[PDB]
Design an enzyme around this catalytic site. Structure first.
Site, PDB file in Angstrom:
ATOM      1  N   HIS A 152     -15.404  -3.244   1.252  1.00 35.49           N
ATOM      2  CA  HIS A 152     -14.346  -4.217   1.045  1.00 35.49           C
ATOM      3  C   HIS A 152     -13.430  -4.203   2.208  1.00 35.49           C
ATOM      4  CE1 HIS A 152     -11.876  -0.847  -0.791  1.00 35.49           C
ATOM      5  NE2 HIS A 152     -10.900  -1.457  -0.132  1.00 35.49           N
ATOM      6  N   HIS A 190      -8.836  -5.403   5.669  1.00 34.72           N
ATOM      7  CA  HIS A 190      -8.906  -4.992   4.303  1.00 34.72           C
ATOM      8  C   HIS A 190      -8.829  -6.134   3.408  1.00 34.72           C
ATOM      9  CE1 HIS A 190      -7.720  -3.270   0.352  1.00 34.72           C
ATOM     10  NE2 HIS A 190      -8.473  -2.196   0.714  1.00 34.72           N
TER      11      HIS A 190
HETATM   12 ZN   LIG Z   1      -9.173  -0.883  -0.851  1.00 38.86          ZN
END
Ligand SMILES: [Zn+2]
Ligand SMILES: Nc1ncnc2c1ncn2[C@@H]1O[C@H](COP(=O)(O)OP(=O)(O)O)[C@@H](O)[C@H]1O
Ligand SMILES: Nc1ncnc2c1ncn2[C@@H]1O[C@H](COP(=O)(O)OP(=O)(O)O)[C@@H](O)[C@H]1O
Ligand SMILES: Nc1ncnc2c1ncn2[C@@H]1O[C@H](COP(=O)(O)OP(=O)(O)O)[C@@H](O)[C@H]1O
Ligand SMILES: O=C[C@@H](O)COP(=O)(O)O
Ligand SMILES: O=C[C@@H](O)COP(=O)(O)O
Ligand SMILES: O=C[C@@H](O)COP(=O)(O)O
Ligand SMILES: [Zn+2]
Ligand SMILES: [Zn+2]
Ligand SMILES: [Zn+2]
Lengths: 489, 161, 489, 489
Positions: free
Chosen positions: B68, B83
């Site tokens: 992610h 992120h």
């Molecule tokens: Zn994270």
């Protein structure tokens, strides 16, 4: 002349050669890798069981000096549930084997419950909604491969359990058969109707095409070139058998990778109301019998854990020695739900936990605690067993690898407040297949020929600490209840 | 269905949109490490769909296990951190999918992680996708572009090293 | 010319010799036995601290080559709470020392709560009902000895904490004094009124007779023959001081046997509404100041645990190396409530637990998990600290023995999302006593003489994983909540 | 398109897949049992290399996703000397493989010396009388089986080395070939005449019948079904090659199970006068070249020893970390003659010894000492190498598994007083086979296509301790001389 049994287990693969007089002649063990690709997941490599199982055979035969010429038959014993799929043409897996422990198909089970099949599944499989069995591991596989379902309707895709896989890889692709014992485990088969469930199959989106042929636990499945293979039965059941389960109310407990407690319920499918499994075993000729089963995932494994990851011991044998250097776990408890809780908890969410630690606790408390978990679990299962079947055991016949642990044995006894009979040959799961093999081959004719190799080697009886058992167990009870539901969804 | 195969239109340091949508003030990230630029500085991006990509020719540093997020080191000694969303790590890798590997060099544009903008759309806490420079110490000037951007196409930041 | 500090700690006893320029010249450490006579119990042996503390002095003095002639003064630092009683005549203990961790007087606390003193005790002691402090350990002692209370009214029985005991054993029986810091810890003393509580004393059945003399944290208590002893302060506080706490809103965290987080609240006794302690520290001249404190029982201890009982590591230093061989705890959590939970939980019932174990978890997951517990706890305490005081730290000044762990340090930083400043001299708790000693002796005159030995050696800043912190902490939170209330009553 | 190499080693079996650009694409390792049936004896199980080597292939191919369709050729690399005999019909061994280390045929060698063949054997084999090579292991086998010699004249009995065995088991029984490299090792083959020695054969009572076909180290031996097998060379030599040995005076040292130091002597068979081996390698097209070799039996093994029997470390990787916690071996020396002494000692009688122990020595001294043995031995071999060849190395190119040990690397450097160049790809022994394969297949055409994948990753240069080297080595020298001649005859 002799039979040869094959025991392909969670931990390892083995090969036993017995004589007519039913004496263990030569053995071969070979351990094999355990993969955890992710936490609550377990997987083994089809080619490795394979390689390991095969290799084990030769080496036994070789060891004793024997050929194709003197072996009456091949008896086959395997680890349950563990699902496998493989391209028919090739002899190659489309995946890794999902092991009985592996909690992957856990959400799937969650749908099943969401839908309303608990009741159904119970009643026809005798099983219980849980990642433990074949079904979901199959669907999960088909579900995580592009050309699967379809490839399998066309039927180039094979399903099977270890016995089935073990067979086919020997009958060079010829034979595709599982036994009755094996099949019950799958969650796809119907124990009354004694055939594949159309519902399960549908609901799960499984294709009758992959399912093998389902046959008696003693029959000549075919021939192979080391010759015929006359025996097949799920491990736990082949041990029920070697103990000469065989009659109503008869019971054993097997202490190995896991713990399996079973009782023959002759021809009656007792419905468990206490966290237990209704499943199939054998009656004296290898015929279908029913039975109550208590499964406990972790037993000998824990020892391996201390032995191999934790690194506290070099050998599992050593556990006796250290655990005995201590008198008490010093308050400590070890709930070994490393791969969920089985009977009668059945919580694929719980995870291993340790409790009651204080600065004075050391390695030896810990080991012993692990050893203790064993008897606790055992005992949990047992009480269930009793309630369910209305019968009160007076002894526990046992067997398994861990059963060489005087300490555990005894402790098991105290904690139950029951005698424990330890059989003189521990390697019973093997023996079982053999008989099923031999018998089926006229190698033996009658079980009776053998109510003699079943010497009791030892009796463990309740020591004075047996008075303390209730407290100690309550310990356990509280600990357990705290390891539950650890993971999330 | 996918033009992935077909040829595209092809046009101090400039950092390129590594994912697409509307650009945002770091300051508005529903997480302090971000919002106070504790972790470093850069912008954010409300996302439009499908995939995350290298924003500098450099070398992918680490890739989060739950895929992610990722970092990467530009051939120009810059550090990037991407992120996706916030607290995304609780989806445990669901929606995400690993195109590249924790070691390779890449040009701008190379696919890095693929994603499921909608599964993520209601599951995740937020979908903001911070893009920050972590080694803020080895950078003189850092500039923030605005408005809309498009993957491996529009640049978000410019910086003087 | 030089001061000499004495640090008598939970784990061990030390002796530091500094110069005027405040340089660590020579040190002596000597570890000492830890007795657990029973589970949640901890005790140390008065003669052993004693022997160990004494012995440590000589050896430092000797090591450097120095005599009675060149030492300006003696500064004294001790472990808190740990209660001691001793026959005045003799110089002999009527018991063993009860340590701050020891959960024995737990029922007693339970009465106290039953009665209604929570409120009171809070408000005047700033303390909180818990076996952690002196009070109850005293009564428990008096309560488990025939000739005690009476023997003590007649006053042949002495009470004291380590500083008090350490002093008297040096001023050959002459001096019976504790400092202001020490006393607050006891649960018998009144922080506003700045004197022994008549109520506590009564309620607890304690006799003013044993209580020592309570004096400034910088004063010449007396002289001793190795010469005067000018300094005294509870360890945590002497470190607040050496960090140059000293001003409002100023804070440090000490990583040793336990973890102690304190913030100077100048002259205002902030009332904790968040599981924290209101207690006394010092202002720049060694004068009384107030402060907020967060106590965490287990930190460095755990490492010792892995090191000494569990036996996974030879040195605590090694923990960095192994913990770093792993990237993740692999799901595992270690709640080290080996001796209850402190702030802000304060549950003398919880016990150590381990969680999220699966077959693939090994030793290194475990170690690291232990290391992690550290920062978690720290962080728990911190959030409290913030809420309470309305201030938001931007850095954490730290110190302690565990603070040499780059890994932990860093991880501490990430998990907080805050910078961490690690001071160049780790041995601060010592330094503190010294100043208090030196100052009080004109050895220094001004703190300012020293806003220079306080170099920062390193800064840890939040890495990219800092984004992950919330999840990871929630882990922790769930784990904790499961170790609670383990023991019973 | 890609080549695939096979490295079947003492410790384990591997499978590397490279691209045209010569990049390591995917690898597969699988370790295998080591049997010591008796002290100075070592043996491996033919079916296990076999199973392990095979299995390794698939898994690499699988791992990358690749088929029969995209693989240019198979390159083959094996462990030397290790003798095997097997019934032609069956594909079954008449025994276990005798490994290169195994000191069994030691008396036999003693006859050979007694007779007068030292001189001969030297001159034609370039080898030296020692259980190290194939010859005697063959005779010892034939000698300890009833129907052998005769069964083998009739020729139902096959001999071979790992390459030969590895081949035949792939060319389904079709091909019986060894390469030039392999053969020199045997003690039966003549390096000048470049063919089997009639004398050896006689003297040893070996039958030309079992000997395979001896062919170029790059040639298409045949085809196999995963396809052609174009490469074969003894491991040490395939690494000489991958380092691009290839030219006169060019040299490398391989740090693996053992240590092998070789130098290309182009086309001249240099006669060792210093405890070294004259043997065959390759010239740029895979043609025959000569070379000087220094064999050292134990290197990485020792680490495994500490790791697996002694149990001081979990991973060999860890040795750096502990060995570095110490500064000195504290006087200790470890002579690892676990299986005799090789070059240039060649004393199948010496056994492992440890020396210079005193009460203060601990585990870490010991480990490091083991690490040190490595460089010592290396250095022994080297000095020989130099004297013999009159050339003075300026750098040591190295490779092997142990070469990831900064410590050892460096220490190696200091102790030599020479730079050490560590190549960026450690897995060179593999690479070698590939080229030999590729080249032979037009996969590459020119070595030159590749004086580029040979990046140097690191240079180790002599630190200040290099001054100390002579003393330290004398240590070593004395130690060695004491482990010699331990066993008896
Ligand atoms: Zn994270
Ligand atoms: N003395 C012992 N105490 C405890 N466990 C033992 C002991 N000896 C062997 N074991 C354990 O017994 C198990 C072997 O059980 P067995 O019935 O052979 O294997 P399987 O799991 O394949 O059915 C292992 O899990 C091992 O860790
Ligand atoms: N590298 C390290 N990592 C973790 N803990 C450490 C390390 N080095 C020392 N320790 C720990 O630090 C502690 C020493 O802390 P310190 O402040 O000296 O002692 P005390 O507990 O008496 O106050 C011990 O609890 C020890 O187990
Ligand atoms: N860091 C290390 N330090 C020391 N030895 C190492 C290290 N890493 C791996 N090894 C050693 O390297 C060896 C592997 O060498 P390699 O060239 O792969 O295997 P082989 O013996 O089959 O030729 C082993 O003997 C092992 O014990
Ligand atoms: O349900 C699985 C059982 O077959 C377990 O058998 P095992 O312990 O031998 O692997
Ligand atoms: O409350 C007790 C404190 O003094 C702990 O100090 P310590 O870690 O040095 O023993
Ligand atoms: O002489 C035997 C050599 O081939 C050793 O090679 P190895 O270290 O890879 O087993
Ligand atoms: Zn079994
Ligand atoms: Zn201290
Ligand atoms: Zn090799």
């Amino acid at each position: 002349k002799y039979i040869v049994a094959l025991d392909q287990g969670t931990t390892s693969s083995r090969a036993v050669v017995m004589d007519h007089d039913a004496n263990i002649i030569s053995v071969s063990q070979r351990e094999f890798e355990q993969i955890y690709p992710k936490p609550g997941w377990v997987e083994h490599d089809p080619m490795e069981i394979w390689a390991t199982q095969s290799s084990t055979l030769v080496e036994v035969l070789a060891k004793a000096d024997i050929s194709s010429d003197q072996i009456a038959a091949i008896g086959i014993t395997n680890q349950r549930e563990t699902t496998i799929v493989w391209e028919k043409e090739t002899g190659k897996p489309i995946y890794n084997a999902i092991v009985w422990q592996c909690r992957r198909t856990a959400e799937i089970c969650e749908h099943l419950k969401r839908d309303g099949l608990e009741d159904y599944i119970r009643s026809n499989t005798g099983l219980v909604i849980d990642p433990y069995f074949s079904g979901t591991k199959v669907k999960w596989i088909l579900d995580h491969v592009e050309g699967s379902r379809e490839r399998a309707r066309r039927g180039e895709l094979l399903f099977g359990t270890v016995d089935t896989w073990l067979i086919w890889k020997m009958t060079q692709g010829r034979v595709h058969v599982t036994d009755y014992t094996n099949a019950s485990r799958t969650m796809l088969f119907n124990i009354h109707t004694l055939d594949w469930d159309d519902k399960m199959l549908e609901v799960l989106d499984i294709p009758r095409e992959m399912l093998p042929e389902v046959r008696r636990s003693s029959e000549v499945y075919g021939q192979t070139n080391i010759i015929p293979i006359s025996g097949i039965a799920g491990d736990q059941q082949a041990a029920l058998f070697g103990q000469l389960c065989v009659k109503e109310g008869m019971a054993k407990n097997t202490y190995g990778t896991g713990c399996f407690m079973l009782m023959n319920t002759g021809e009656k499918a007792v419905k468990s109301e206490n966290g237990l499994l209704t499943t199939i075993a054998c009656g004296p000729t290898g015929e279908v019998n029913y039975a109550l089963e208590g499964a406990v995932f972790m037993a000998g494994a824990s020892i391996q854990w201390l032995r191999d990851e934790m690194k506290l011991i070099n050998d599992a044998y050593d556990s006796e020695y250290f655990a005995t250097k201590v008198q008490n776990t010093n308050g400590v408890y070890v709930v070994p739900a490393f791969t969920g809780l089985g009977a009668p908890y059945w919580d694929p969410y719980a995870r291993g936990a340790i409790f009651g630690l204080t600065r004075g606790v050391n390695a030896n408390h810990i080991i012993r605690a692990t050893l203790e978990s064993i008897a606790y679990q055992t005992r949990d299962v047992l009480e269930a067993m009793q309630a369910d079947s209305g019968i009160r055991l007076h002894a526990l016949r046992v067997d398994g690898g861990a059963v060489a642990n005087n300490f555990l044995m005894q402790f098991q006894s105290d904690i139950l407040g029951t005698r424990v009979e330890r059989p003189e040959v521990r390697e019973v799961t093997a023996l079982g297949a053999a008989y099923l093999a031999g018998l089926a081959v006229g190698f033996w004719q009658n079980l009776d020929e053998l109510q003699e190799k079943a010497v009791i080697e030892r009796e463990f009886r309740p020591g004075i600490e047996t008075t303390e058992r209730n407290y100690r167990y309550a310990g356990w009870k509280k600990a357990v209840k705290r390891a539950m539901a650890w993971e999330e969804h | 269905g996918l033009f992935d195969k077909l040829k595209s239109l092809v046009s101090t340091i400039e950092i390129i949109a590594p994912l697409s949508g509307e650009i945002v003030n770091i300051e508005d990230v529903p997480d302090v490490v971000f919002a106070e630029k504790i972790v470093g500085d850069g912008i954010a991006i409300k996302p439009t769909g499908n995939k995350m990509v290298a924003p500098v020719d450099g070398t992918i540093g680490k890739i989060f296990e739950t895929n992610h997020a990722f970092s990467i080191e530009s051939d120009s000694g810059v550090e990037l951190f991407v992120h996706f969303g916030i607290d995304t790590v609780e989806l445990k890798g669901e929606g995400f999918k690993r195109i590249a590997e924790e070691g390779q060099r890449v040009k701008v544009g190379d696919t890095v992680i693929e994603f499921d903008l909608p599964l993520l759309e209601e599951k995740a806490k937020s979908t903001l996708t911070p893009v920050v420079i972590s080694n803020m110490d080895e950078i003189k000037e850092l500039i923030k572009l605005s408005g809309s951007v498009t993957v491996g196409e529009t640049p978000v930041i410019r910086i003087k090293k």
